[PDB]
């Protein structure tokens, strides 16, 4: 929300594709569901580690996913 | 096994790649047949390597056997 001098003018902030993306660095370890499985929102989806501690990752959205990093990246 | 040998192994193994590999090799094809060609060979290539990598790997363990271990005493 930006305000100049008494107009305003909101922008939006591109969280739209619907593209899941890691929060950190890292790496991966393995994928939980199959490629092609559906998801629902909520449910984990990848395995991942950064810090050598092991980190889950739970979809945003329902819907069907496909994979592009292969296992171990 | 960096990556310039692991390319070195898909030479002899990805029949998609040998078979790039071995059209690129005709003399005087034309100019955007191997444009073409190039390009594909970039591609798989690239979209190779994690397979290969776990293969060198695999490799690499098939020497940190105890068999090894007990032949050398």
């Known amino acids: 929300r930006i305000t100049?001098?008494?107009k305003?003018?909101?922008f939006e902030k591109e969280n739209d594709p619907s593209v899941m993306r890691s929060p950190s660095a890292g790496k991966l370890i393995?994928?939980?569901v199959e490629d092609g499985g559906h998801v629902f929102a909520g449910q984990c989806y990848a395995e991942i580690e950064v810090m050598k501690m092991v980190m889950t990752?739970?979809?945003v959205e329902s819907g069907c996913i496909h994979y592009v990093k292969?296992?171990?990246a | 096994f960096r990556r310039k040998d692991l390319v070195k192994t898909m030479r002899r193994v990805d029949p998609?790649?040998?078979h790039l590999a071995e059209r690129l090799g005709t003399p005087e094809?034309?100019?955007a047949e191997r444009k073409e060609l190039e390009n594909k060979l970039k591609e798989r290539e690239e979209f190779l390597i994690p397979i290969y990598h776990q293969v060198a790997v695999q490799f690499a363990d098939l020497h940190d056997t105890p068999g090894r271990m007990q032949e050398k005493g």
């Open chain 1, 4 to 6: 100049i001098g008494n």
């Open chain 1, 8 to 10: 305003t003018c909101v």
């Open chain 1, 30 to 32: 393995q994928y939980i």
């Open chain 1, 57 to 59: 990752l739970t979809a």
């Open chain 1, 70 to 72: 292969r296992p171990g």
């Open chain 2, 16 to 18: 998609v790649y040998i």
């Open chain 2, 29 to 31: 094809l034309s100019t």
